[PDB]
Amino acid sequence: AAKDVKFGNDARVKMLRGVNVLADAVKVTLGPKGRNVVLDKSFGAPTITKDGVSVAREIELEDKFENMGAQMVKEVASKANDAAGDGTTTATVLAQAIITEGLKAVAAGMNPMDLKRGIDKAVTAAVEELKALSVPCSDSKAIAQVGTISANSDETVGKLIAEAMDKVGKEGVITVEDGTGLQDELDVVEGMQFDRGYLSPYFINKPETGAVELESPFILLADKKISNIREMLPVLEAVAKAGKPLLIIAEDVEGEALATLVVNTMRGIVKVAAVKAPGFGDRRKAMLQDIATLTGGTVISEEIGMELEKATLEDLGQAKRVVINKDTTTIIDGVGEEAAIQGRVAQIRQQIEEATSDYDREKLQERVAKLAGGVAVIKVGAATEVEMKEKKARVEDALHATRAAVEEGVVAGGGVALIRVASKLADLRGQNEDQNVGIKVALRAMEAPLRQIVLNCGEEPSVVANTVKGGDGNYGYNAATEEYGNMIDMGILDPTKVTRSALQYAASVAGLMITTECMVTDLP
């Protein structure tokens, strides 16, 4: 296992080249007038896309060192995208700008740690100013406006998002399904979602969405860790002869069992998904029992006496539809007795009335809200199936954007919020010259994305950036109409969470990369 080691400036230069390649591939798509990029496929028909997430996913460098740098930048950008629902290309552009400026500063002879601390101070102040500039959208009218704007100025999508948001609640869960009719409708069904995802990425069967979807799947509920397969041969073969998919909810699935599941999924004879149980300790067991009473099944506990071998088909829980993502799952319209759910929620209410501490009180309140609020599913309608799928994807994107907005408000989009906060912080200073240099690096990097957008528009980035900086408030430059004005009023905005998350992960990866000292990677 011989490995190649690069020390000092060599590794940093290789990382700079890798991140430069990744950001040059991704940033061309930034902005409303984003350049097309061609991703060649093995089949023979290349796919032309204008979204940075796919370009980042396809990018992988031949050189090991540059590949490592691009991979870490892509990882932090994907973290930002998953946390916020958008902002891969913005985070990548910010990261590239900070890396370039910080590596130039390091080559001058300044302390990388002081530069990193200055960058962190600058981005913390920028986040504070951005939060100050955020415009809340708690009211339903602004929710509808944000939903409409996010869905490329479509009023029906915004109306659907607003109605569902009001129906389930501000923190509720909303799922999108294709409707059988032309008219679109929404309804509230029993279900819940939790903060656990799929154990193996190979379980995905919908590469376009990057999520696992099952139609009327059985649900297995066992708190015992599964490592042997012989314990689950009977239930697995019962599910197979039934023909329905299986969802495995357990404390942890690993060892030969996980390998058996993944190879069976690859062979496609039986579709099965394994999901780690939510929480830990007795709270995990309580959540598992809540899922069991929601889906009509029963948990399998080694302490009580029932075993996986003796578990039968009717013992497994049943749901109408489940969705598994990398971070969170979802159960939609899980079939279960109404009386059982009412009894369980009454028991949880009794427990919260008898709750002693405040932490367990909040935990029980969150659990009861999850159990009783349910999931609101929206059925999108269209004339044809192609329009149906397009509108479903558009509605999902609008839903993500609106959830981010209602979580953290909205700020002027098009990359002018970063310009505003940079102009505000122009007078910020640190406790050392190197920290001041890092702060200036961060401010210029925050200026960069608007420059990239306007360059994609073909105009001069410097003049437009200076004109935007001269203004105040939500005043900015629109890329589509090639003219200035208030970005919020004229329909260009993004949720504050997206910008904040992109800036924060860009700063974090920049701090990690600037202070990177050496590398360890395998020989070519």
UniProtKB/Swiss-Prot annotation:
Annotated catalysed reactions: ATP + H2O + a folded polypeptide = ADP + phosphate + an unfolded polypeptide
Amino-acid positions noted as binding ATP in the UniProt annotation, renumbered to this chain: 29-32, 50, 86-90, 414, 478-480, 494
GO molecular function, one term: isomerase activity
Superkingdom in the source lineage: Bacteria
CDD domains linked: GroEL
SUPFAM superfamilies assigned: GroEL apical domain-like, GroEL equatorial domain-like, GroEL-intermediate domain like
GO biological process: chaperone cofactor-dependent protein refolding; protein folding; protein refolding; response to heat; response to radiation; virion assembly
Localization per record: Cytoplasm
Residues where N6-acetyllysine is found: K116
Main location class: cytoplasm
Entries under PROSITE patterns matching the protein: CHAPERONINS_CPN60
Impact upon substituting D397A: Can bind ATP with normal affinity, but is defective in ATPase activity. Binds non-native rhodanese, but cannot release the protein
Signal peptide: none
Pfam families per record: Cpn60_TCP1
Known regulation of activity: During the substrate-folding cycle, the two GroEL rings separate for effective substrate binding and chaperonin activity. Ring separation is triggered by ATP binding to the trans ring of the asymmetric GroEL:GroES complex and avoids formation of functionally impaired symmetric GroEL:GroES2 complexes. Activity of the GroEL-GroES chaperonin complex requires Mg-ATP. UMPylation of the chaperone by SelO/YdiU negatively regulates its activity, and may facilitate survival under stress conditions.
EC main group: isomerase
Protein name: Chaperonin GroEL
Organism, scientific name: Escherichia coli (strain K12)
The encoding gene: groEL
